[PDB]
Amino acid sequence: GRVIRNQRKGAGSIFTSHTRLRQGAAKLRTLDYAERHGYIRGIVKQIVHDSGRGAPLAKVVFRDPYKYRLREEIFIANEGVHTGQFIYAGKKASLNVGNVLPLGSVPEGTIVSNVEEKPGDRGALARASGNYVIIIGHNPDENKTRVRLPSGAKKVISSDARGVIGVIAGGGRVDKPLLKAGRAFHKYRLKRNSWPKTRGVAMNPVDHPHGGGNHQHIGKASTISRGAVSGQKAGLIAARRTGLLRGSQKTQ
Amino acid sequence: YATVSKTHKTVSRAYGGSRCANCVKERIIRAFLIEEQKIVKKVVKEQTEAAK
Amino acid sequence: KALKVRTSATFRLPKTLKLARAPKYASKAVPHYNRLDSYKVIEQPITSETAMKKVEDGNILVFQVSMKANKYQIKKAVKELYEVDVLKVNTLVRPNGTKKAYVRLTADYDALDIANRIGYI
Amino acid sequence: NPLTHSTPKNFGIGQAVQPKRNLSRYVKWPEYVRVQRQKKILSIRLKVPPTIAQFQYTLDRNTAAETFKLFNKYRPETAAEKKERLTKEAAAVAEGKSKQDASPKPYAVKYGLNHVVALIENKKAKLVLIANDVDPIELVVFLPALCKKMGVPYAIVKGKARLGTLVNQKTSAVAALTEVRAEDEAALAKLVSTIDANFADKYDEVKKHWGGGILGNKAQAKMDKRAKNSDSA
RNA sequence: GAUGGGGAAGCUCCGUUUCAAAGGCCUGAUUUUAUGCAGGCCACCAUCGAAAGGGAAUCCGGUUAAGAUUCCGGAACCUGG
RNA sequence: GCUUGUGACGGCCCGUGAAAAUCCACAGGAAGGAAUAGUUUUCAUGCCAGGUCGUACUGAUAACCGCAGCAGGUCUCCAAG
RNA sequence: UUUACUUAUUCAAUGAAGCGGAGCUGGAAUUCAUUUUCCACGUUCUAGCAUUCAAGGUCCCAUUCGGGGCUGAUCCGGGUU
């Protein structure tokens, strides 16, 4: 009967919509002949800050070619542009600063925005692709593209996307310690809650399968197997290494 | 607004609703700038595919 | 036998025809009787000191309505009698079983001269 | 007149509003429409069953014309012109005491499709036709076999609705003649040599081979264009 | 918390638009036809859901054994037909 | 002096300050139109109509919720010298 | 392991939005007799501007302030990006 606080997401209450503060999504509108190989132009004016974190959002509203309507669509903005600057991204034209081109019509060094990973389709039924323009070099070989990130993974996919060049002031926010503390509730009153990460040498005594009793010491390995039991998964999963990464790089 | 007469809000004028201050002036000044450059891209810039 | 012109919205709902929808007989032959009449709405006028005050201070009559009524079933009831117009109808709520009502008149008719003529004194 | 110009007009796609064009598929198709277009195919898309392979073959309008007109003179009387006739023979058959005596012979054309028994064991089958739509798929794979074994001249035709009008119904079947008059005697034996030389000679050869090679759609707009560059670019 | 889908022997639950044939109006030919065939448009298309929030409109004074911004007297405004 | 309300700023934003209906305005100008007569139903003036339900006292150190005439718990408005 | 053609399953949008092959045509690249191949097919300095069966031609009830084809926007495919 006494469960652990890893098996909670099955009530639909304290895990539901908790983000009044925000507005809309970020996925683009209807795709046509324009928003792909040929000619695609974007806009950015009211750079309203992204609610919940540190990012900009723009009121990218396109005059619908199919019908006289200008539905307000809050999309992701970028840093470097002022209050109003149209995108100059033409496949049959050229390239400048802050443009939107597929991952095939551009050479190495192309950090676009995130929207989709599939050859376009207004939010591909998937998403296991890139997080946006954030991409270095590509691959001239056919329509394939080999991306790479310092996270430690590889991926080979297509070379078509609707991401625009631009940056977001996020670097430094996590590099600068939460000095003036008082952050946990309003911290992750954002979308849900996942910041209690939470201890007790005697949190649940006549139990602790890990190891505790009456003294600060564990017993069993906190490395719970992935395919073994879904009733003991409390702590590390599928361990391999453990060390200390120093600041001095200069490696191979 | 509907309770009061029409002659208490916009009694005349024209370009004055969603824009004001100096936006009423900018909607004509900048317009004349580009339209005068349209002629160039209709006879002068169309001399590329003239000598086939 | 070629390209049918459909340059509009998707032809969804068909174009039905309104047939002569008329019954061959009455739904229940004899319709329900009228539950509204002048000789059923009013009942027994309450004779008290509180009632007399609410008569000569605004030209209002005092009776006793049944239950379900509005500002017309009482108004039309008076007009059906001796043809008397009503300026304002007052309907109250009596949470016990019965109910009361007030009937206002015009500046032409008199409340005291119509009270001893309708029935009571 | 003096303001005569030329060249097509251009809208900036994002700018302006475009009007509806020649909508063909835009007016989205109904539910079972996307189903029926993939339902009744059989001999169009992929391969065909050797037991049939006759739905792709049709009859010319030069022979079928004389065939339909031949069955025009042979048809039972309708319900509107038969029930009233019973009152006319009241003083000739009923009160006349003459059961099937003072009456002309009703030369009716033969019929029957999925219910044929007495027309095989008694050898009373001549001209045999095949239905068009045929909803029961299981009731068509043994129709030519009911004529090939007995040597009955079967004719692979398409249609049974118009022939249902000369039978006082809606759908028809075969149309053989066992007791035909001398008026259309030469107009019946002439069609025998035609059917036997265009249908009876093609059964064993058709049974062996499967049947296919039919072009599809966009599929042949890339597959055939690939072999062209693979052999001689 | 439904219809149109998708499990189960029955009693039902979740989701709220996740393959639509969902809704039927302005005008032309028609006051006295309670409306049958063709163009040009609009993507909203079960409901319920706050007596501290949201919100076009009325206050003061006097009388009675009790209670009003409701009746009486005086002074005004808005919406729909 | 204190209390309440409003306009114009700064500081705070590692944690970034809901949703909907009605009314009004601007851009755009497609239909229908006048000399003993056309064109607004928007101002002024005048006339008519607008249901049902809810409704008082009290609301707490003699009135609700703890067998009871209990010293417990119990939201909100104006806040004197 | 295995390229194309797959009447069965699932499938984001769905107001099937301007698509692929083929097909009236340029330019770039060099020669074997011609188009047997590869980029073409409405915005790209500025919240200044943009729509109403597109501004223009031919064919009709006649001199009408409107309306009805084709071209503009040719097909196949009905598996539209």
From Swiss-Prot, chain A:
The keyword RNA-binding applies. InterPro entries: NA-bd_OB-fold, Rib_uL2_dom2, Ribosomal_uL2, Ribosomal_uL2_C, Ribosomal_uL2_CS, Ribosomal_uL2_dom3, Ribosomal_uL2_RNA-bd_dom, Translation_prot_SH3-like_sf. One of its GO terms (cellular component) is cytosol. One of its GO terms (molecular function) is RNA binding. GO terms for biological process: cytoplasmic translation; maintenance of translational fidelity; ribosomal large subunit biogenesis. It is found in: Cytoplasm. Keywords: Cytoplasm, Isopeptide bond, Phosphoprotein, Ribonucleoprotein, Ribosomal protein, RNA-binding, rRNA-binding, Ubl conjugation. There is a cross-link at K45, K92, K118, K144 (Glycyl lysine isopeptide (Lys-Gly) (interchain with G-Cter in ubiquitin)). It comes from the Eukaryota. Component of the large ribosomal subunit (LSU). Mature yeast ribosomes consist of a small (40S) and a large (60S) subunit. The 40S small subunit contains 1 molecule of ribosomal RNA (18S rRNA) and 33 different proteins (encoded by 57 genes). The large 60S subunit contains 3 rRNA molecules (25S, 5.8S and 5S rRNA) and 46 different proteins (encoded by 81 genes). There are 2 genes for uL2 in yeast. This is Large ribosomal subunit protein uL2A.
Curated annotation (Swiss-Prot), chain B:
It comes from the Eukaryota. Signal peptide: none annotated. It is found in: Cytoplasm. Belongs to the eukaryotic ribosomal protein eL34 family. Component of the large ribosomal subunit (LSU). Mature yeast ribosomes consist of a small (40S) and a large (60S) subunit. The 40S small subunit contains 1 molecule of ribosomal RNA (18S rRNA) and 33 different proteins (encoded by 57 genes). The large 60S subunit contains 3 rRNA molecules (25S, 5.8S and 5S rRNA) and 46 different proteins (encoded by 81 genes). Component of the ribosome, a large ribonucleoprotein complex responsible for the synthesis of proteins in the cell. The small ribosomal subunit (SSU) binds messenger RNAs (mRNAs) and translates the encoded message by selecting cognate aminoacyl-transfer RNA (tRNA) molecules. The large subunit (LSU) contains the ribosomal catalytic site termed the peptidyl transferase center (PTC), which catalyzes the formation of peptide bonds, thereby polymerizing the amino acids delivered by tRNAs into a polypeptide chain. Present with 23600 molecules/cell in log phase SD medium. This is Large ribosomal subunit protein eL34A. It comes from Saccharomyces cerevisiae (strain ATCC 204508 / S288c) (Baker's yeast). The gene is RPL34A. The chain holds residues 62 to 113 of 121 of the full protein.
UniProtKB/Swiss-Prot annotation, chain C:
Keywords: Cytoplasm, Isopeptide bond, Ribonucleoprotein, Ribosomal protein, RNA-binding, rRNA-binding, Ubl conjugation. It is found in: Cytoplasm. This is Large ribosomal subunit protein uL23. InterPro entries: Nucleotide-bd_a/b_plait_sf, Ribosomal_uL23-like, Ribosomal_uL23/eL15/eS24_sf, Ribosomal_uL23_CS, Ribosomal_uL23_N. It holds the Pfam family Ribosomal_L23. One of its GO terms (cellular component) is cytosol. Component of the large ribosomal subunit (LSU). Mature yeast ribosomes consist of a small (40S) and a large (60S) subunit. The 40S small subunit contains 1 molecule of ribosomal RNA (18S rRNA) and 33 different proteins (encoded by 57 genes). The large 60S subunit contains 3 rRNA molecules (25S, 5.8S and 5S rRNA) and 46 different proteins (encoded by 81 genes). uL23 is associated with the polypeptide exit tunnel. There is a cross-link at K40 (Glycyl lysine isopeptide (Lys-Gly) (interchain with G-Cter in SUMO)). Belongs to the universal ribosomal protein uL23 family. One of its GO terms (biological process) is cytoplasmic translation. Its main location: cytoplasm. The gene is RPL25. One of its GO terms (molecular function) is structural constituent of ribosome.
From Swiss-Prot, chain D:
Keywords: Cytoplasm, Ribonucleoprotein, Ribosomal protein. It comes from the Eukaryota. It holds the Pfam family Ribosomal_L7Ae. One of its GO terms (cellular component) is cytosolic large ribosomal subunit. One of its GO terms (biological process) is maturation of LSU-rRNA. It is found in: Cytoplasm. Component of the large ribosomal subunit (LSU). Mature yeast ribosomes consist of a small (40S) and a large (60S) subunit. The 40S small subunit contains 1 molecule of ribosomal RNA (18S rRNA) and 33 different proteins (encoded by 57 genes). The large 60S subunit contains 3 rRNA molecules (25S, 5.8S and 5S rRNA) and 46 different proteins (encoded by 81 genes). PANTHER family: RIBOSOMAL PROTEIN L7AE FAMILY MEMBER. Component of the ribosome, a large ribonucleoprotein complex responsible for the synthesis of proteins in the cell. The small ribosomal subunit (SSU) binds messenger RNAs (mRNAs) and translates the encoded message by selecting cognate aminoacyl-transfer RNA (tRNA) molecules. The large subunit (LSU) contains the ribosomal catalytic site termed the peptidyl transferase center (PTC), which catalyzes the formation of peptide bonds, thereby polymerizing the amino acids delivered by tRNAs into a polypeptide chain. Belongs to the eukaryotic ribosomal protein eL8 family. Present with 238000 molecules/cell in log phase SD medium. There are 2 genes for eL8 in yeast. This is Large ribosomal subunit protein eL8A. The gene is RPL8A.
